[PDB]
């Protein structure tokens with residue numbers, strides 16, 4: 001009848017890979033604690049404490065799941081960033097008196113990246129001011145767009161659809177002597193792409209006035 005043992009954590013700390021945006025109620029991992037006491041003196045109750053809005057836990061099986069709060073690798077908030085990557089877990093037996101394990105157990109989640117973000121322009125849309133009789137091979141603008149994704153998924157390149165844009169630099173160069181009487185205003189649709197295998201794009205207008 002004496003509660004002879006505390007619960008004892010097993011293979012802690014835990015390190016786990018999880019893709020971001022993983023659907024709600026998707027399995028993450030199963031935390032495990034040991035207590036050889038018979039009856040309620042060894043019956044365990046797991047719990048996430050402090051509470052984590054990105055994960056739920058089966059009190060009896062110690063099995064963690066995701067919630068209707070999606071996991072976002074590009075979430076700018078430092079408070080959330082940590083919750084998404086660190087799950088602190090408390091356990092107790094149901095004995096008389098009830099005993100906790102003498103410390104919690106951290107689950108370290110590694111958030112794997114999806115190409116879920118598209119490029120977004122820093123300096124577009126814009127209106128570039130130029131004087132007529134500007135000869136060919138003159139830079140007028142340099143387009144900048146950023147992608148919050150990781151590695152190749154965040155690497156932004158530039159394309160169009162009387163000018164040419166260098167795909168690496170985002171620099172916009174002329175190909176002819178510009179004249180007010182031929183075309184005084186150009187609307188140029190610059191398409192910014194990333195390097196994901198399902199490539200994501202983003203278009204905005206550079207308005208050249210002569």
Ligand SMILES: [Ca+2]
Pocket residue numbers: 003004005006007035037041042093095099
């Ligand atoms: Ca016990």
Ligand SMILES: [Ca+2]
Pocket residue numbers: 020073074113114115116117148149150
């Ligand atoms: Ca992403």
Ligand SMILES: [Ca+2]
Pocket residue numbers: 115116117118119147148149153154194196200
């Ligand atoms: Ca991207």
Ligand code: NA
Pocket residue numbers: 020072073074075116117
């Ligand atoms: Na994201």
